[PDB]
């Protein structure tokens, strides 16, 4: 690359890892969408919500591909592992798995920031904080709040009205 | 499933295989998009075209997930294999690889149609013909035509003007 | 909290301290507003200006309450001390007191950033820089410029015209 | 003050006490807003309601500051005591605390009216009746009705649907 | 009067006195208007302001004539005394004279309220509070603030700019 | 300055050096614009592009002068050195010199961030990251991509069409 | 140049000198802009005026660069000398220095017109009269009129109101 400047191989490699982490998260949410689309589960607003989350995570991955290109790094793809489950259990169990995924993504992004900081990558530390860390703490808060509300509404009628009310 | 009717396990499994085929194709096009976004290749209209193709292949996958759910089948995810290459070569070679992928997708859809036909699935034979086979012969024709135009324009200035003129 | 991640008790505590600092600053500005609303002082644009500053400082406090909630910290309220004075003196003296308060708010925000940095809170260092430090240097600059203009316009007619012209 | 006429020191003092009463009530509601914004409570419409009540109580304070200035009295600020609790308990417990606060505010306003009446302040008795006592009986009725509906809806799903339905 | 009910001769007479008080105040302001319209004084916005105040005072009179009629009292006109001066002196002196007049009008309206109160005229006490005591408190505040601003702006250029700036 | 706070002489001096660096870059682009405006070169879109780049670099200088003033630093101008060349050679040679200039500018901004960081200037580190480092990596990427496309289009007809196509 | 006709080396050289004179005048006005943007001076309309004058002088330079190219001359850049001062003193002193710079610009333009006239450059004599001499006498008149008005308004309140009134 004629452009590449103050961009360490360790950071280039960590961005490639994070690209895979985001594509995997997209895959998990696509599977959770399919789950709520089952004809014996049939919660369309939750199914649509997880599809939007899947699209957003794919967007996280492609934005990191774009900054890799801007910095003059080379994207290196890895297998996208299938999610841990096809069947995600109750509404609560699925939102719990989602909170755990968002906390894992955040842990991974904090490690990426740390590597960039260790290598004095003044551009990429700010890029990660602005474009990733801010949305990540809002997503985790969102999922924690959904879990409080799913438990409060309770199974059955509460899950039915949660689907109706929550994603207006 | 209370809905499932005239829907054979062999057909449900074939639909799951095709979902993975389409997700794999989405991944290949995402990789080709990154290739043309390299700062030493820098054909942005071609990079945008392959991103659009990646989006479309993901749509093929999610629409098969939808018809799996409509028929009362259950979606089962597999690993999405990394693409065969990260380096796709020249404009011509990338479009040739894309044509090969579209013909592989078509071969897989024709096999899916044949399994549905063998099991007397009168809904799914028509669904595959209308929603997949028609689009697939159009996609293959588009890629054959792109290859003719890339060869005609030729390397260097032709590749530059193909990027400028063919997608606008 | 199911959300709380990489959020140290020291940072949670310092955010609670800064909430009180901002609520105190809001109170000081409310008192300065009442001063210029006195029938024997009667500078209505300055009174309105200090009320707007009071509103803005209360917004600074409530925004920190929101980020405390987002990070999964717990808000803890303290008494809001009455301002140092009820009589704020001349236009110049009130604006000098306001500049001192803005500099004290900034010193507190820089300390909060320091604590976040020491605890490797990569989210909150950026949050404080973006949402607080940038605003604070523009506030301090605004008050230094007001003070330059009050001095230039001078006591009596200058104060009357400053009130008429400076907030229009 | 060149304006001050038929305005007794006892009434001036009682208006300053009431300004502190309203600022305290504003703080209580700000604290209740934080409680319902906790990620493990997460009743956002209730949180926004208590923030609006906090804004309204602050407006009650600033309107009494304006009439203090109009009558030629001098505003004297006191410490704003922290609320009795940071942790306000159930929806019902918070709304019961709010009703008790509104009744305490009303008792303090009736005492203020009483002092104005005792001193033949024909302007301020009418001002208190029009601008405070009318609003205060409506607010108390509003809170009594909220409590009736919270009890009717009941804990769990009722609290979720009260938050969804009551503030729209 | 077929209408007259709970309306004492003492209150009827006090309303007729207040009508004369308001017509006198209108005449004073008309005289102050002429003063500032002198070709050797030539403060057009102040002259227009005092003409507006003269119009308002006549409105105070005619509104009291209307409520006299509504209550079934009979209007009894007295001479309108010429104002104390034709030459009102400086801007500050005219505004001081204006404030004294507003305070005198206010004392007279509080006495009228007192008479209505003594006679248990529950309609007229409230009418006087709403229609007269509120306006009078704002007018007295207005004139006190004008005097503070005349004093601040100072003589000569300050008077010229007070005329330009103070009345929109 | 009454405003200046946590703003070290070394940082103030470094901001002044960076103002000169940006003004020098503006001059270089102005020179390159004149080169492509020569009647024997006559590539008007490239000439316009380099004039826009000159305008942008001058904006980079004047924004740094603004933040110097906000922080209470004092602007100190130095001579703006004439560019290294008046004759910038071929389209490729000019764009290669531009890339080298952007990388030099980036090296200077990274040094400036480093000085701010050493002096614990929490405001200015973030300001440089947000306002300078982000744009600088995008500019460098843009110039690397221009060079790839100039080489691909090739000399003569390619340069003619590059000028026609690349800036439209 | 295939275009160059009736264009003497002495005139080509003098246009290059005048380009440097205009770029220098732009730099002086940018410095004066920074001076009025100081937090202890804070005359924003004057700061904006001098920034507009800096932009105008840069436009004078780029317009001469364009006529150099039209006539088939070659632009040759020289160092842009830093202004005489960073600190320009009072409002009057700044406008006095501006008047002197405009008079120096005019002397330089009249010398350029003289050289063109001596070399019988019938195009460039008219070009300089129309595009430079007409604007130059208007700019000198404007700066002489500003100085008259700055002295009339006087230092302190006059400078404050000159900033408010003169550039609207
Ligand atoms: Fe993500
Ligand atoms: Fe497909
Ligand atoms: Fe603040
Ligand atoms: Fe209240
Ligand atoms: Fe009246
Ligand atoms: Fe730059
Ligand atoms: Fe000029």
């Amino acid at each position: 690359s004629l452009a590449r400047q103050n961009y360490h191989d360790e950071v280039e490699a960590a961005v490639n890892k994070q690209i895979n982490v985001e594509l995997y998260a997209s895959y998990v949410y696509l599977s959770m969408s399919a789950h709520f689309d089952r004809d014996d589960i049939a919660l369309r607003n939750i199914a649509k919500f997880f599809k939007e989350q899947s699209d957003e995570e794919r967007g996280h991955a492609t934005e990191l591909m774009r900054i890799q290109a801007v910095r003059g790094g080379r994207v290196a793809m890895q297998n996208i592992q299938k999610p841990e489950k096809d069947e995600w259990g109750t509404v609560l169990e699925a939102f719990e798995a989602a909170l755990a995924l968002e906390r894992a993504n955040n842990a991974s992004l904090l490690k990426l920031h740390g590597i960039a900081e260790q290598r004095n990558d003044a551009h990429l530390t700010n890029y990660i904080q602005e474009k990733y860390l801010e949305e990540q703490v809002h997503s985790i808060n969102e999922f924690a709040r959904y879990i409080a509300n799913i438990k409060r509404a309770g199974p059955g009628l509460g899950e039915y009205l949660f689907d109706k009310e929550e994603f207006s």
Side-chain angles (χ1 to χ4, degrees), chain A:
Chain A
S1 168
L2 303 178
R4 187 172 177 162
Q5 188 179 29
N6 193 39
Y7 196 61
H8 197 282
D9 286 348
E10 189 182 9
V11 175
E12 172 183 33
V15 166
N16 283 329
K17 182 63 244 260
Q18 191 60 35
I19 288 166
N20 192 262
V21 167
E22 298 294 341
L23 289 175
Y24 171 79
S26 178
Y27 204 10
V28 175
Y29 283 138
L30 182 55
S31 175
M32 289 187 179
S33 190
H35 182 67
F36 287 102
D37 233 31
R38 286 173 51 125
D39 63 17
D40 63 343
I41 299 187
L43 297 171
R44 182 82 80 187
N45 298 135
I46 296 178
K48 283 179 170 167
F49 170 72
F50 282 124
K51 180 53 160 56
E52 293 166 354
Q53 295 303 291
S54 179
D55 298 348
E56 279 180 17
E57 291 309 315
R58 182 162 173 275
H60 296 166
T62 65
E63 172 55 30
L64 282 164
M65 292 172 61
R66 290 194 64 180
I67 206 66
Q68 181 79 288
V70 166
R71 291 306 300 276
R74 179 73 57 81
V75 172
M77 299 307 195
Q78 295 309 148
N79 295 344
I80 309 160
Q81 297 300 313
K82 65 178 194 153
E84 285 301 293
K85 311 167 179 201
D86 291 303
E87 295 187 45
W88 292 98
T90 63
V91 171
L92 181 58
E93 283 171 326
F95 276 80
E96 286 174 330
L99 171 63
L101 181 68
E102 292 289 341
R103 289 176 62 92
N105 288 347
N106 193 37
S108 185
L109 287 162
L110 290 170
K111 176 184 185 167
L112 180 58
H113 171 272
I115 293 164
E117 182 184 40
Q118 288 159 30
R119 295 299 191 186
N120 298 134
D121 197 328
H123 164 266
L124 207 74
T125 55
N126 177 69
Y127 173 87
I128 295 156
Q129 288 169 311
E130 258 176 17
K131 305 302 168 60
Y132 287 85
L133 297 192
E134 196 69 63
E135 209 299 276
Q136 197 56 67
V137 299
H138 286 89
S139 187
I140 294 170
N141 171 70
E142 185 183 354
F143 277 101
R145 292 168 61 82
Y146 286 138
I147 289 164
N149 279 291
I150 295 157
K151 287 193 305 179
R152 180 184 309 276
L157 181 56
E159 289 166 320
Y160 175 76
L161 297 174
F162 174 88
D163 171 277
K164 283 291 181 284
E165 292 283 312
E166 214 32 79
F167 307 97
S168 63

